[PDB]
Amino acid sequence: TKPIVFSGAQPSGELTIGNYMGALRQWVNMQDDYHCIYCIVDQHAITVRQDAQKLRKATLDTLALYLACGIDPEKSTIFVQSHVPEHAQLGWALNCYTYFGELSRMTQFKDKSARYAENINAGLFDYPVLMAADILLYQTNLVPVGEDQKQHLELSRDIAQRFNALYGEIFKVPEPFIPKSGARVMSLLEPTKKMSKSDDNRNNVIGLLEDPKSVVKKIKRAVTDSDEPPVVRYDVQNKAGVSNLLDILSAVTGQSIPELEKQFEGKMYGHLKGEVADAVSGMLTELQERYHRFRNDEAFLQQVMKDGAEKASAHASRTLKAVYEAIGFVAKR
Amino acid sequence: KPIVFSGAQPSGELTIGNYMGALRQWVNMQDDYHCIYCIVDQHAITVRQDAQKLRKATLDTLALYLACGIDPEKSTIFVQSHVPEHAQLGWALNCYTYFGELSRMTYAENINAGLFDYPVLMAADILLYQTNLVPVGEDQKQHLELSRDIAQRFNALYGEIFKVPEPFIPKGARVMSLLEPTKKMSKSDNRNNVIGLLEDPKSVVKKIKRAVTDSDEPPVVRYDVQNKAGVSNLLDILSAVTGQSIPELEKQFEGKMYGHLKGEVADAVSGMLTELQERYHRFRNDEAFLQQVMKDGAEKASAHASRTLKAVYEAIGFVAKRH
Ligand SMILES: Nc1ncnc2c1ncn2[C@@H]1O[C@H](COP(=O)(O)OC(=O)[C@@H](N)Cc2c[nH]c3ccccc23)[C@@H](O)[C@H]1O
Numbered sequence: 001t002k003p004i005v006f007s008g009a010q011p012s013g014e015l016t017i018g019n020y021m022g023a024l025r026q027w028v029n030m031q032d033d034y035h036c037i038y039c040i041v042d043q044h045a046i047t048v049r050q051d052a053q054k055l056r057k058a059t060l061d062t063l064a065l066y067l068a069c070g071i072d073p074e075k076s077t078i079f080v081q082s083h084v085p086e087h088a089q090l091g092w093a094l095n096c097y098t099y100f101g102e103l104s105r106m107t108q109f110k111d112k113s114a115r116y117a118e119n120i121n122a123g124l125f126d127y128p129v130l131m132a133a134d135i136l137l138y139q140t141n142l143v144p145v146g147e148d149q150k151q152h153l154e155l156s157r158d159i160a161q162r163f164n165a166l167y168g169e170i171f172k173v174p175e176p177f178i179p180k181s182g183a184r185v186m187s188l189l190e191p192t193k194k195m196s197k198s199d200d201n202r203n204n205v206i207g208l209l210e211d212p213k214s215v216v217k218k219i220k221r222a223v224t225d226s227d228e229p230p231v232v233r234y235d236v237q238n239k240a241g242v243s244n245l246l247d248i249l250s251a252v253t254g255q256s257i258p259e260l261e262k263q264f265e266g267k268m269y270g271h272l273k274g275e276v277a278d279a280v281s282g283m284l285t286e287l288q289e290r291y292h293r294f295r296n297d298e299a300f301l302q303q304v305m306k307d308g309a310e311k312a313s314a315h316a317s318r319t320l321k322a323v324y325e326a327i328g329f330v331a332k333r
Numbered sequence: 334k335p336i337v338f339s340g341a342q343p344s345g346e347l348t349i350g351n352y353m354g355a356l357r358q359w360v361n362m363q364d365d366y367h368c369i370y371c372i373v374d375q376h377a378i379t380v381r382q383d384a385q386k387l388r389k390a391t392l393d394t395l396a397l398y399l400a401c402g403i404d405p406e407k408s409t410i411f412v413q414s415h416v417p418e419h420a421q422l423g424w425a426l427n428c429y430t431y432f433g434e435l436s437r438m439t440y441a442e443n444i445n446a447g448l449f450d451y452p453v454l455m456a457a458d459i460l461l462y463q464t465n466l467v468p469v470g471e472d473q474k475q476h477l478e479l480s481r482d483i484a485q486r487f488n489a490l491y492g493e494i495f496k497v498p499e500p501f502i503p504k505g506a507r508v509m510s511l512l513e514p515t516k517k518m519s520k521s522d523n524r525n526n527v528i529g530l531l532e533d534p535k536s537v538v539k540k541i542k543r544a545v546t547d548s549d550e551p552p553v554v555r556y557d558v559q560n561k562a563g564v565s566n567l568l569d570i571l572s573a574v575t576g577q578s579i580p581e582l583e584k585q586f587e588g589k590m591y592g593h594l595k596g597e598v599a600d601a602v603s604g605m606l607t608e609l610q611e612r613y614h615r616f617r618n619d620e621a622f623l624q625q626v627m628k629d630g631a632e633k634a635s636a637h638a639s640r641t642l643k644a645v646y647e648a649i650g651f652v653a654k655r656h
């Protein structure tokens with residue numbers, strides 16, 4: 001049997017080129033090499049307060065976006081997290097092998113709490129324990145994520161090791177798969193602030209389902225530097241805007257930074273921004289064409305969800321049964 | 334008919350204070366209310382324990398509740414972990430519970446997240462069954478109020494999805510500690526202060542013989558909680574078992590010493606525990622019966638739990654499961 005890949009994306013906000021380059025792109029490429037399981041984590045999404053209609057719609061948007069990106073329901077398991085009770089079940093049990101200190105220190109909790117001060121709920125605190133359960137249920141070997149999720153994974157490895165130490169080899173210990181380019185794509189007007197899918201300012205983001213023409217305009221208006229002469233070079237501390245653009249260019253084309261720097265020799269930010277704009281505009285136009293064919297076919301989405309959940313439940317139930325046996329619960333008949 | 338929900342923790346040996354003081358009451362109200370008894374193994378794992386002891390103690394708890402007279406045909410009795418809706422609703426309710434409310438209940442970096450988050454599970458356990466009444470002790474009054482606040486908050490956003498649970502106000506027997514007659518007899522205790530429902534006649538005698546009395550000269554068997562705590566407890570225990578009034582017993586032991594009282598108390602108690610113990614060992618040593626009660630209970634629980642969770646999930650706006 002192949003090693004298992006597991007990842008998730010929240011059905012909240014609007015997925016960006018950041019979400020694509022740091023996660024989805026890898027998801028699509030791993031599908032034959034490994035046994036891949038992709039999850040729409042609607043249970044994680046409600047740690048920030050959602051309009052009920054927005055959540056339902058955004059869950060089906062996320063599904064259609066996965067399919068449009070090239071996730072193949074014939075190769076991978078695609079499912080919605082809340083359709084598999086084993087996630088919440090393992091999550092509770094895994095709370096009892098997770099320390100408060102491990103949860104208090106989490107950066108996402110801190111950053112989330114400050115932004116939604118009027119909704120610092122216990123789910124937001126306990127977010128990482130559900131995310132561990134998500135991963136450990138499927139005997140996962142690899143987890144393809146962006147750099148912002150590194151510490152959440154690390155806790156899951158500690159949990160898995162902690163549990164195994166007491167009870168034997170119930171879990172596999174997962175390992176991160178973070179891309180070489182575009183693991184943390186930066187905001188257009190704030191190149192020191194990560195690109196957010198729920199940013200107040202849309203001018204910071206390249207949205208995957210945004211009008212391409214609006215994206216070319218955002219790229220032209222992206223912040224650069226006062227360098228005289230203007231030079232296209234990777235200098236993150238001194239050239240964050242230009243660099244982030246060069247990295248976007250790299251990961252869309254597959255080209256190297258050294259190659260790009262060479263290609264833009266004797267040229268300025270006009271040549272740069274024109275090239276990033278052509279690359280990304282062509283990608284979004286193709287993706288969006290696929291997206292609409294999928295998103296408007298409810299019967300197809302419904303089938304994918306149904307088959308997905310069945311496959312996941314077969315894996316999930318097997319793992320939970322052994323967890324429950326280990327911890328000493330009377331087994332259900 | 335009001336829905337009553339009780340959590341019975343698979344651990345802890347039940348005392349005579351539990352049986353004649355609480356359970357015996359509720360056995361006799363199973364036609365008055367739709368009573369639900371949930372063995373809460375998911376709550377138990379907040380404290381690390383031996384897995385095989387937890388499994389055994391779950392079945393020990395079930396057998397004893399059946400032996401105390403909980404009828405699986407009138408009441409719903411089941412194991413918490415057999416109904417996934419508990420953990421499912423638990424997570425969803427985490428997202429409507431302030432972190433502050435969990436920290437407001439009784440260094441801390443070394444406690445497991447279970448010990449911190451379990452009141453949300455308690456809220457879910459109760460709210461799943463549209464519960465009207467929750468019989469709670471004072472240790473768990475703060476927890477019920479959190480359950481009430483959570484239900485109201487959710488309801489105000491989404492409509493009347495939950496019933497707002499109420500405490501069961503009415504309390505009737507006072508069973509106090511044998512060597513500390515001011516403290517109520519509790520399983521959580523010096524086992525010389527308590528009498529377990531599975532204790533033998535010989536152990537009962539030894540514990541009652543040690544029970545504190547007073548230095549009154551001559552010894553006088555009269556009820557007086559302030560001045561004669563030990564003797565008063567012995568009288569209350571005897572009354573609870575036999576149904577004889579205190580005044581009747583005060584006459585029955587006129588001109589008698591505390592040894593006579595102690596001897597009669599031990600006979601009465603051991604007399605009561607015997608038919609309980611008979612049913613217990615008979616139920617406990619019948620796997621298929623226990624397995625059948627558990628199967629039936631969980632099916633009944635899941636039928637009702639599933640309708641609440643489905644309405645909660647629709648309100649929140651999750652895409653419904655296809656299956
Ligand atoms: N600007 C950015 N540049 C590069 N990568 C980025 C950028 N912003 C986001 N990402 C990555 O995109 C994925 C989706 O993030 P979400 O917020 O939906 O989703 C999250 O943040 C997860 N908690 C969802 C989750 C829940 N359970 C799981 C189990 C395994 C893996 C993942 C999950 C992520 O991989 C994230 O790292």
Ligand SMILES: CC#CC(=O)N1CC[C@@H](n2c(=O)n(-c3ccc(Oc4ccccc4)cc3)c3c(N)ncnc32)C1
Pocket residue numbers: 338339340341342373375376377379380438439448451454455456458459467472473475
């Ligand atoms: C603040 C304070 C206080 C206080 O004085 N104490 C003493 C007992 C301490 N404490 C619990 O009460 N529980 C617990 C166990 C089972 C349970 O089941 C139900 C479910 C629904 C309805 C009734 C009972 C509910 C709670 C604890 C736990 N799981 N894990 C640890 N401690 C638990 C709280």
Ligand SMILES: O=c1[nH]c2cc(Cl)ccc2o1
Pocket residue numbers: 087088089090091092095126129130131133419420421422423424427450451453454457
């Ligand atoms: O990860 C988690 N935490 C949880 C807390 C409750 Cl009450 C239920 C399920 C959970 O899953």
